[PDB]
Amino acid sequence: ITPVTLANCEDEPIHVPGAIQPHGALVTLRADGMVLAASENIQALLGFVASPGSYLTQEQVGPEVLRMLEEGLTGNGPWSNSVETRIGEHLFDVIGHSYKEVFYLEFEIRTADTLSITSFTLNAQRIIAQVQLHNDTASLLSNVTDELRRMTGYDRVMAYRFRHDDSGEVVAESRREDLESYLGQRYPASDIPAQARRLYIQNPIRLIADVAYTPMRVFPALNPETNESFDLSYSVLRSVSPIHCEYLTNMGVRASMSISIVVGGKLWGLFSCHHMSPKLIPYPVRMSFQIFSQVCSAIVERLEQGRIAELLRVSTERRLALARRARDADDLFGALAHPDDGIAALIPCDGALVMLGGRTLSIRGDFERQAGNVLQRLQRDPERDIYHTDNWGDCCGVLAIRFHRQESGWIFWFRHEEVHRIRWGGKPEKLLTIGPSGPRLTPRGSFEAWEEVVRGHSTPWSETDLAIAEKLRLDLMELCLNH
Numbered sequence: 001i002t003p004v005t006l007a008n009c010e011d012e013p014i015h016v017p018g019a020i021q022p023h024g025a026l027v028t029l030r031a032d033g034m035v036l037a038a039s040e041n042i043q044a045l046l047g048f049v050a051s052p053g054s055y056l057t058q059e060q061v062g063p064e065v066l067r068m069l070e071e072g073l074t075g076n077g078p079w080s081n082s083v084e085t086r087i088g089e090h091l092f093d094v095i096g097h098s099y100k101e102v103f104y105l106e107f108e109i110r111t112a113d114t115l116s117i118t119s120f121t122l123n124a125q126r127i128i129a130q131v132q133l134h135n136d137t138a139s140l141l142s143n144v145t146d147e148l149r150r151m152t153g154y155d156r157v158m159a160y161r162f163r164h165d166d167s168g169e170v171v172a173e174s175r176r177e178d179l180e181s182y183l184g185q186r187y188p189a190s191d192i193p194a195q196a197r198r199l200y201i202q203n204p205i206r207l208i209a210d211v212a213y214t215p216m217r218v219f220p221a222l223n224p225e226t227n228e229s230f231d232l233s234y235s236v237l238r239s240v241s242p243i244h245c246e247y248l249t250n251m252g253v254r255a256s257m258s259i260s261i262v263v264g265g266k267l268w269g270l271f272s273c274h275h276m277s278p279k280l281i282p283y284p285v286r287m288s289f290q291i292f293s294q295v296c297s298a299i300v301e302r303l304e305q306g307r308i309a310e311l312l313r314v315s316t317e318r319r320l321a322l323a324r325r326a327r328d329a330d331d332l333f334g335a336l337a338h339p340d341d342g343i344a345a346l347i348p349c350d351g352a353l354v355m356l357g358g359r360t361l362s363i364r365g366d367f368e369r370q371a372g373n374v375l376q377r378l379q380r381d382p383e384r385d386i387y388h389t390d391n392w393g394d395c396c397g398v399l400a401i402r403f404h405r406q407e408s409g410w411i412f413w414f415r416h417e418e419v420h421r422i423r424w425g426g427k428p429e430k431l432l433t434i435g436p437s438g439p440r441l442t443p444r445g446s447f448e449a450w451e452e453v454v455r456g457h458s459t460p461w462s463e464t465d466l467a468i469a470e471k472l473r474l475d476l477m478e479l480c481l482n483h
């Protein structure tokens, strides 16, 4: 019965809302096919009253439907299927699935004049051609963002990248003129709490037909079998958190639809479609996106590792240049401090320090004091050959490696505090009408929430950055020992 406030919202059970969106009806069955619960609108949408204890009957739901249901009813492992069928006055999409051991049948009115197979195929071809045309991982995102809008007619579609700390960044955008831009927006991991994030990962597509909707409750609330709520995780019609709904209306959005990009076990980022008026996307089309989601995820994965590959390649090429120079010139300092192949170019940094013997070369600033303090901190830890941190002198980020012990051969890279890369301003943008929860649920409030998180922090060191440092360290050890 608990109200969901700003304090609660992190722990909101959004998977068991026990209600569904109004653009469809829902019937929940148990293993034997016996009805356990239904949305309060089954009668109003489909001509009949589903009742707990009942079993579904032909042409109160039609034949092919039970035909489908029986197949999944007798199959081990998460059944999933859909049928198209006429029930009374209308034809329906009857998407059905089984999660836990409860079976779900979802009913959407089908208004499309097209054959489903071809509608599905047509859109799949169109939206994944965008995945064959681009080598830049960012062109991919940018282009499919522009294309998703062309296909769906959404007012605004955005592409979101998720950082290491699960903070988001709007990296692409295609929007109707009128609308303010959110390009370069940054938001915290708290604006998509655990359960919501778990769900985007498990579900390629989420659709919100109308944010201003009144939910259609499924009765009864609790599954008699367990005396605990129905887990609508894989339910297409599952209802929305009032918090998110308030957020979206603060923005002035009325319909959403998001396509996930999952790589590893991580939500790599999603495409979020917004509309200013309510909007619906037919089932077969959503399936076009679902399959797309899986392929795009695959290509983004490769494109990303193709990116790291090239980073490693030019790094070694520079380690080669470095090895070449060092042996022939015989001062390392000159080699390391080289403007372009220098260490400052090896790994993205705002500065670097080279330190062998008693001599100190600070390149791109005065870093001698910091390096001294960092080194003192490592006093307590004589065995550390590598040190790094984004919390901390005057530079937040530090990556230090040791290549000579006795003569204190050290290398440092430094990073300043992370800064909002792109920022809007210039003319006060319009007044958002703000709900009861407060300004926290506006983009402006989200950004501020993000600042408070990152400030005091430099950008984390790449998986890649550390790998390079490690290779460099090996190089110099080799050199110093060798000659």
Ligand SMILES: */C=C/C1=C(C)C(=O)N/C1=C\C1=NC(=C\c2[nH]c(/C=C3\NC(=O)C(C=C)=C3C)c(C)c2CCC(=O)O)/C(CCC(=O)O)=C1C
Pocket (backbone or CB within 6 Å): 006, 009, 010, 014, 158, 160, 170, 182, 185, 187, 190, 191, 192, 193, 196, 206, 208, 239, 240, 241, 243, 244, 247, 256, 257, 258, 272, 273, 440, 441, 442, 443, 446
């Ligand atoms: C304390 C919990 C929450 C706060 C605070 C909050 O702002 N939202 C909270 C719960 C949920 N967030 C959900 C998803 C979600 N998060 C955002 C935030 C942004 N997206 C942007 O593009 C920008 C700025 C450019 C921001 C600030 C959005 C838009 C969404 C909706 C996802 C979508 O549009 O597809 C979320 C999911 C709820 C659901 O739809 O089930 C919850 C519960």
